Amino acid sequence: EVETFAFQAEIAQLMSLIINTFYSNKEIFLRELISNSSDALDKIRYESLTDPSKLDSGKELHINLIPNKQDRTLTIVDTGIGMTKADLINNLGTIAKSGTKAFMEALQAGADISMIGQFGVGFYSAYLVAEKVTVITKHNDDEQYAWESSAGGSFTVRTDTGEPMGRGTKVILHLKEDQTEYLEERRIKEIVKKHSQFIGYPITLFVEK
């Protein structure tokens, strides 16, 4: 059972704007995704100060950067609060319509793509370097779901059958054929130290063969 949904008209034109606009400062995607992971970890930590039973699905709060050359994927793993099914379909799409409309008005006013985080839609910066994005997430109050989109105005959602996460969000970036630089160890270490040095959670960058 794989359900296919259509993006909102405002989210669709933002995606095509990110896909089609010539813009060479593409590395800002990792800051936006790590900043998105840091917010999810803050929310589960806050909910735990008044309820220590919410870490039952995992006490550790960290962020993992796992590059893969054989599959040509960069994965950002966090043990944050996760996202529910209503989040993946209705909720965040409604929150993002205002920041989207504000982001375009800023772009015609002189702003550039790197300012996408101050409008709450920084996740779509992943499509600067990805031709397809997979999101595996697990919320304490919901099952494990798989989100996927390759632009075009549509996305899919299904119940994931893979490895149980316990709690968190896994963002898999299927890198474009000409964007394999973000699979290199020394490159990722440079973007992290430059853009996300003050993230208050341990960031472990994995290495491969």
Ligand X SMILES: Cc1c(CO)cnn1-c1ccccc1
Of the pair 66, 92, the CB lying nearest ligand X is at 92
The residues in 134-193 that bind ligand X, with binding defined as CB under 6 A, are 135, 147
Euclidean distance between CA atoms 159 and 147, whole angstroms: 9
Q: Is the dihedral of CA 156, 162, 164, 165 positive or negative?
A: negative
Question: Least Å distance between CB 37 and ligand X?
Answer: 10
Q: Of 35 and 180, which has the nearer Cβ to ligand X?
A: 35
Annotated binding site for ATP: 36, 78, 97, 123
> Interface residues for ligand X in 95-114 (CB under 6 A)?
96
The single residue among 28, 55, 63, 121 that binds ligand X, judged by CB under 6 A, is: 121
Positive or negative: CA dihedral 73, 148, 92, 41: negative
Answer for which of 63, 74, 76, 88 binds ligand X (CB under 6 A) is: 88
User: Please, which residues bridge with residue 65 across strands?
Assistant: 76, 205
Per residue, the 3-state secondary structure of 19-63, as one string, reads: HHCCCCCCCHHHHHHHHHHHHHHHHHHHHHHCCHHHHHHCCCCCE
CB of 130 to ligand X, least distance (A): 12
Shortest Cβ 182–ligand X spacing (Å)? 19
Contact positions toward ligand X, by CB under 6 A? 88, 92, 96, 120-123, 135, 147
